[PDB]
Amino acid sequence: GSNECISVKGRIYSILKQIGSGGSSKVFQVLNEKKQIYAIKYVNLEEADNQTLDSYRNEIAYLNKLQQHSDKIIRLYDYEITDQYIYMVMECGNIDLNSWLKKKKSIDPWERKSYWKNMLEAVHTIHQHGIVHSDLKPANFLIVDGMLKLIDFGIANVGTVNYMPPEAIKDMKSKISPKSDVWSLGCILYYMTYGKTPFQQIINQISKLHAIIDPNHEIEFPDIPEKDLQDVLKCCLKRDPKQRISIPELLAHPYVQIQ
Ligand SMILES: Cc1cc(-c2ccc3nc(Nc4ccc(C(=O)N5CCOCC5)cc4)nn3c2)cc(C)c1O
Protein backbone atom coordinates (compact mmCIF):
# COMPACT_ATOMS: atom_id res chain seq x y z
CA GLY A 1 0.00 0.00 0.00
CA SER A 2 0.85 3.71 -0.25
CA ASN A 3 -0.28 7.17 0.96
CA GLU A 4 -0.50 8.49 -2.62
CA CYS A 5 -2.40 11.69 -3.09
CA ILE A 6 -3.92 14.20 -5.41
CA SER A 7 -4.66 17.73 -4.44
CA VAL A 8 -7.45 19.26 -6.44
CA LYS A 9 -8.65 22.77 -5.48
CA GLY A 10 -6.74 22.42 -2.20
CA ARG A 11 -8.62 19.30 -1.04
CA ILE A 12 -6.68 16.05 -0.59
CA TYR A 13 -7.75 12.69 -2.05
CA SER A 14 -6.13 9.35 -1.20
CA ILE A 15 -5.87 6.97 -4.17
CA LEU A 16 -7.36 3.50 -3.79
CA LYS A 17 -6.58 2.32 -7.33
CA GLN A 18 -6.21 3.33 -10.97
CA ILE A 19 -9.02 2.26 -13.37
CA GLY A 20 -8.48 4.17 -16.71
CA SER A 21 -5.32 4.70 -18.84
CA GLY A 22 -3.98 5.69 -22.26
CA GLY A 23 -4.31 9.11 -23.73
CA SER A 24 -2.31 11.33 -21.44
CA SER A 25 -5.01 10.64 -18.92
CA LYS A 26 -5.73 8.40 -16.02
CA VAL A 27 -8.78 7.74 -13.94
CA PHE A 28 -8.39 6.96 -10.21
CA GLN A 29 -10.70 5.61 -7.57
CA VAL A 30 -10.29 7.86 -4.63
CA LEU A 31 -11.17 8.74 -1.04
CA ASN A 32 -11.78 12.29 0.15
CA GLU A 33 -11.16 13.72 3.64
CA LYS A 34 -14.64 12.55 4.84
CA LYS A 35 -13.68 9.00 3.66
CA GLN A 36 -16.28 9.41 0.84
CA ILE A 37 -15.56 7.68 -2.48
CA TYR A 38 -15.05 9.50 -5.83
CA ALA A 39 -13.34 9.22 -9.21
CA ILE A 40 -10.64 11.57 -10.49
CA LYS A 41 -9.79 11.92 -14.14
CA TYR A 42 -6.35 13.45 -14.67
CA VAL A 43 -5.04 14.79 -18.01
CA ASN A 44 -1.45 15.89 -18.72
CA LEU A 45 -1.31 18.81 -21.17
CA GLU A 46 2.40 19.32 -22.18
CA GLU A 47 1.54 17.04 -25.11
CA ALA A 48 -1.68 18.61 -26.45
CA ASP A 49 -2.22 20.94 -29.41
CA ASN A 50 -4.72 23.83 -29.31
CA GLN A 51 -7.42 21.61 -30.85
CA THR A 52 -7.09 18.84 -28.23
CA LEU A 53 -6.90 21.66 -25.63
CA ASP A 54 -10.03 23.44 -26.91
CA SER A 55 -11.88 20.08 -26.89
CA TYR A 56 -11.01 19.28 -23.26
CA ARG A 57 -12.15 22.77 -22.32
CA ASN A 58 -15.36 22.11 -24.23
CA GLU A 59 -16.03 18.72 -22.57
CA ILE A 60 -15.65 20.45 -19.13
CA ALA A 61 -17.99 23.33 -20.01
CA TYR A 62 -20.62 20.88 -21.29
CA LEU A 63 -20.26 18.52 -18.31
CA ASN A 64 -20.80 21.66 -16.28
CA LYS A 65 -23.84 23.04 -18.14
CA LEU A 66 -25.66 19.69 -18.51
CA GLN A 67 -25.38 18.71 -14.81
CA GLN A 68 -28.21 21.09 -13.96
CA HIS A 69 -30.44 19.58 -16.66
CA SER A 70 -30.08 15.83 -15.91
CA ASP A 71 -29.04 13.25 -13.31
CA LYS A 72 -28.15 10.86 -16.20
CA ILE A 73 -25.08 12.85 -17.13
CA ILE A 74 -22.15 11.83 -14.93
CA ARG A 75 -21.78 14.36 -12.10
CA LEU A 76 -18.73 16.65 -12.02
CA TYR A 77 -18.23 18.02 -8.52
CA ASP A 78 -15.04 19.99 -8.94
CA TYR A 79 -12.25 20.59 -11.37
CA GLU A 80 -8.87 22.28 -11.57
CA ILE A 81 -7.41 23.36 -14.90
CA THR A 82 -3.95 24.78 -15.49
CA ASP A 83 -1.61 25.21 -18.48
CA GLN A 84 -0.02 21.77 -17.68
CA TYR A 85 -2.93 19.63 -16.37
CA ILE A 86 -6.61 19.03 -15.77
CA TYR A 87 -8.04 17.27 -12.69
CA MET A 88 -11.77 16.43 -12.59
CA VAL A 89 -13.54 14.97 -9.53
CA MET A 90 -16.62 13.01 -10.51
CA GLU A 91 -19.10 10.61 -9.00
CA CYS A 92 -17.84 7.09 -8.98
CA GLY A 93 -19.14 4.10 -10.84
CA ASN A 94 -19.59 0.45 -10.02
CA ILE A 95 -19.04 -0.72 -13.55
CA ASP A 96 -19.46 0.38 -17.12
CA LEU A 97 -22.27 -0.95 -19.24
CA ASN A 98 -19.87 -2.63 -21.74
CA SER A 99 -18.18 -4.88 -19.18
CA TRP A 100 -21.59 -5.40 -17.47
CA LEU A 101 -23.30 -6.67 -20.64
CA LYS A 102 -20.70 -9.39 -21.19
CA LYS A 103 -20.90 -10.85 -17.63
CA LYS A 104 -24.66 -10.42 -16.99
CA LYS A 105 -26.33 -13.84 -17.39
CA SER A 106 -29.63 -13.02 -19.16
CA ILE A 107 -31.22 -9.60 -18.43
CA ASP A 108 -34.41 -8.71 -16.48
CA PRO A 109 -36.96 -7.07 -18.83
CA TRP A 110 -37.93 -4.41 -16.22
CA GLU A 111 -34.17 -3.68 -15.76
CA ARG A 112 -33.55 -3.26 -19.54
CA LYS A 113 -36.52 -0.93 -19.93
CA SER A 114 -35.14 1.23 -17.13
CA TYR A 115 -31.65 1.28 -18.66
CA TRP A 116 -33.20 2.17 -22.02
CA LYS A 117 -35.09 5.10 -20.43
CA ASN A 118 -31.91 6.31 -18.74
CA MET A 119 -30.06 6.25 -22.04
CA LEU A 120 -32.86 8.08 -23.87
CA GLU A 121 -33.01 10.85 -21.26
CA ALA A 122 -29.24 11.44 -21.30
CA VAL A 123 -28.95 11.56 -25.10
CA HIS A 124 -32.14 13.68 -25.27
CA THR A 125 -30.49 16.17 -22.89
CA ILE A 126 -27.27 16.47 -24.89
CA HIS A 127 -29.38 16.81 -28.05
CA GLN A 128 -31.17 19.76 -26.50
CA HIS A 129 -27.85 21.57 -26.15
CA GLY A 130 -26.79 20.76 -29.75
CA ILE A 131 -24.44 17.91 -28.96
CA VAL A 132 -24.73 14.96 -31.35
CA HIS A 133 -22.34 12.35 -29.85
CA SER A 134 -22.17 10.18 -33.05
CA ASP A 135 -19.88 7.51 -31.44
CA LEU A 136 -22.29 6.01 -28.84
CA LYS A 137 -21.64 2.55 -27.40
CA PRO A 138 -22.06 0.77 -23.98
CA ALA A 139 -18.69 2.04 -22.67
CA ASN A 140 -20.08 5.63 -22.80
CA PHE A 141 -22.53 4.67 -20.05
CA LEU A 142 -21.83 4.02 -16.38
CA ILE A 143 -23.98 2.13 -13.84
CA VAL A 144 -24.24 4.19 -10.60
CA ASP A 145 -26.68 2.65 -8.11
CA GLY A 146 -28.68 0.91 -10.83
CA MET A 147 -28.90 3.90 -13.12
CA LEU A 148 -27.13 4.46 -16.42
CA LYS A 149 -25.17 7.73 -16.69
CA LEU A 150 -23.61 9.29 -19.74
CA ILE A 151 -19.88 9.96 -19.23
CA ASP A 152 -18.55 11.02 -22.67
CA PHE A 153 -20.02 13.35 -25.40
CA GLY A 154 -18.09 12.21 -28.50
CA ILE A 155 -16.34 15.57 -28.19
CA ALA A 156 -12.56 15.17 -27.38
CA ASN A 157 -10.15 12.75 -29.19
CA VAL A 158 -9.33 -1.91 -30.92
CA GLY A 159 -12.77 -0.32 -30.40
CA THR A 160 -15.97 -2.22 -31.16
CA VAL A 161 -17.34 -0.93 -34.55
CA ASN A 162 -20.56 -2.66 -33.61
CA TYR A 163 -22.78 0.38 -32.79
CA MET A 164 -21.85 2.58 -35.75
CA PRO A 165 -24.58 4.30 -37.82
CA PRO A 166 -24.74 4.05 -41.68
CA GLU A 167 -24.40 7.77 -42.35
CA ALA A 168 -21.10 7.93 -40.37
CA ILE A 169 -19.84 5.68 -43.13
CA LYS A 170 -20.58 7.95 -46.14
CA ASP A 171 -18.16 10.88 -45.91
CA MET A 172 -15.55 8.09 -46.05
CA LYS A 173 -23.75 18.50 -39.00
CA SER A 174 -24.58 18.37 -42.77
CA LYS A 175 -24.22 14.51 -42.86
CA ILE A 176 -24.70 13.41 -39.18
CA SER A 177 -27.98 14.24 -37.40
CA PRO A 178 -29.46 13.33 -34.00
CA LYS A 179 -30.82 10.28 -35.79
CA SER A 180 -27.25 8.90 -35.78
CA ASP A 181 -27.47 8.49 -31.99
CA VAL A 182 -30.84 6.65 -32.33
CA TRP A 183 -29.22 3.91 -34.41
CA SER A 184 -26.48 3.43 -31.78
CA LEU A 185 -28.92 3.41 -28.89
CA GLY A 186 -30.86 0.93 -31.08
CA CYS A 187 -27.85 -1.41 -31.21
CA ILE A 188 -27.32 -1.16 -27.46
CA LEU A 189 -30.97 -2.14 -26.92
CA TYR A 190 -30.54 -4.79 -29.62
CA TYR A 191 -27.70 -6.30 -27.55
CA MET A 192 -29.83 -6.26 -24.40
CA THR A 193 -32.78 -8.06 -26.09
CA TYR A 194 -31.19 -10.66 -28.39
CA GLY A 195 -27.91 -11.21 -26.45
CA LYS A 196 -25.70 -9.67 -29.22
CA THR A 197 -25.50 -6.70 -31.69
CA PRO A 198 -27.01 -6.93 -35.23
CA PHE A 199 -23.63 -7.64 -36.92
CA GLN A 200 -21.65 -9.23 -34.06
CA GLN A 201 -21.32 -12.53 -35.95
CA ILE A 202 -20.20 -10.72 -39.17
CA ILE A 203 -16.66 -11.47 -40.24
CA ASN A 204 -13.74 -9.04 -41.16
CA GLN A 205 -14.57 -5.58 -39.68
CA ILE A 206 -14.68 -4.18 -43.25
CA SER A 207 -17.26 -6.92 -43.99
CA LYS A 208 -19.49 -5.49 -41.20
CA LEU A 209 -19.33 -1.95 -42.67
CA HIS A 210 -20.81 -3.35 -45.89
CA ALA A 211 -23.79 -4.87 -44.02
CA ILE A 212 -24.39 -1.68 -41.98
CA ILE A 213 -24.71 0.37 -45.18
CA ASP A 214 -26.29 -2.41 -47.32
CA PRO A 215 -30.07 -1.72 -47.57
CA ASN A 216 -30.83 -5.23 -48.93
CA HIS A 217 -29.08 -6.74 -45.86
CA GLU A 218 -31.96 -7.49 -43.46
CA ILE A 219 -31.53 -7.34 -39.67
CA GLU A 220 -33.45 -10.14 -37.95
CA PHE A 221 -36.01 -9.38 -35.25
CA PRO A 222 -37.09 -12.68 -33.62
CA ASP A 223 -40.51 -12.68 -31.95
CA ILE A 224 -39.75 -11.93 -28.31
CA PRO A 225 -42.70 -11.56 -25.86
CA GLU A 226 -42.49 -7.74 -25.58
CA LYS A 227 -44.15 -6.62 -28.82
CA ASP A 228 -43.49 -2.94 -28.12
CA LEU A 229 -39.76 -3.55 -27.53
CA GLN A 230 -39.61 -5.37 -30.87
CA ASP A 231 -41.03 -2.30 -32.68
CA VAL A 232 -38.64 0.11 -30.92
CA LEU A 233 -35.70 -1.87 -32.32
CA LYS A 234 -37.06 -1.92 -35.88
CA CYS A 235 -37.69 1.86 -35.78
CA CYS A 236 -34.25 2.59 -34.32
CA LEU A 237 -32.41 0.41 -36.82
CA LYS A 238 -33.80 1.92 -40.04
CA ARG A 239 -30.96 2.81 -42.42
CA ASP A 240 -32.50 6.00 -43.83
CA PRO A 241 -32.33 8.61 -41.02
CA LYS A 242 -35.37 10.34 -42.54
CA GLN A 243 -37.46 7.23 -41.73
CA ARG A 244 -35.58 6.36 -38.52
CA ILE A 245 -37.47 7.27 -35.31
CA SER A 246 -36.63 10.44 -33.34
CA ILE A 247 -35.74 10.63 -29.63
CA PRO A 248 -38.88 12.59 -28.82
CA GLU A 249 -40.88 9.92 -30.63
CA LEU A 250 -39.05 7.21 -28.65
CA LEU A 251 -40.03 8.89 -25.32
CA ALA A 252 -43.69 8.70 -26.37
CA HIS A 253 -43.46 5.09 -27.61
CA PRO A 254 -45.52 2.50 -25.65
CA TYR A 255 -42.39 0.52 -24.69
CA VAL A 256 -41.22 3.36 -22.39
CA GLN A 257 -44.76 4.60 -21.57
CA ILE A 258 -46.99 1.53 -20.75
CA GLN A 259 -46.02 -1.19 -18.18
C1 LIG B 1 -12.58 9.06 -19.23
C2 LIG B 1 -13.73 9.48 -18.32
C3 LIG B 1 -14.07 8.67 -17.23
C4 LIG B 1 -15.12 9.01 -16.36
C5 LIG B 1 -15.46 8.19 -15.26
C6 LIG B 1 -16.13 8.71 -14.13
C7 LIG B 1 -16.47 7.89 -13.05
C8 LIG B 1 -16.15 6.53 -13.07
N1 LIG B 1 -16.33 5.52 -12.22
C9 LIG B 1 -15.79 4.45 -12.81
N2 LIG B 1 -15.78 3.21 -12.26
C10 LIG B 1 -15.50 2.07 -12.94
C11 LIG B 1 -14.83 1.03 -12.27
C12 LIG B 1 -14.53 -0.17 -12.92
C13 LIG B 1 -14.90 -0.35 -14.26
C14 LIG B 1 -14.59 -1.65 -15.02
O1 LIG B 1 -15.51 -2.41 -15.31
N3 LIG B 1 -13.33 -1.94 -15.40
C15 LIG B 1 -13.06 -3.20 -16.16
C16 LIG B 1 -11.75 -3.14 -16.97
O2 LIG B 1 -11.41 -1.78 -17.31
C17 LIG B 1 -11.07 -1.03 -16.12
C18 LIG B 1 -12.20 -1.02 -15.07
C19 LIG B 1 -15.57 0.67 -14.93
C20 LIG B 1 -15.87 1.87 -14.28
N4 LIG B 1 -15.29 4.80 -14.00
N5 LIG B 1 -15.48 6.00 -14.19
C21 LIG B 1 -15.15 6.83 -15.28
C22 LIG B 1 -15.83 10.20 -16.62
C23 LIG B 1 -15.50 11.02 -17.71
C24 LIG B 1 -16.28 12.31 -17.97
C25 LIG B 1 -14.45 10.66 -18.56
O3 LIG B 1 -14.13 11.47 -19.61
Swiss-Prot record:
Source organism superkingdom: Eukaryota
Tissue and organ distribution: Present in rapidly proliferating cell lines.
The UniProt record lists the keyword Acetylation: yes
Keyword Nucleotide-binding: yes
Cellular-component GO terms for this entry: cytoplasm; kinetochore; membrane; nucleus; spindle
Record-listed ATP binding positions: 19-27, 41
Subunit record text: Interacts with TPR; the interactions occurs in a microtubule-independent manner. Interacts with MAD1L1 and MAD2L1.
Recorded family membership: Belongs to the protein kinase superfamily. Ser/Thr protein kinase family.
Protein name (Swiss-Prot/TrEMBL): Dual specificity protein kinase TTK
Taxonomic lineage from the root: Eukaryota, Metazoa, Chordata, Craniata, Vertebrata
Gene that produces this protein: TTK
Included range, full protein: 515 to 794 of 857
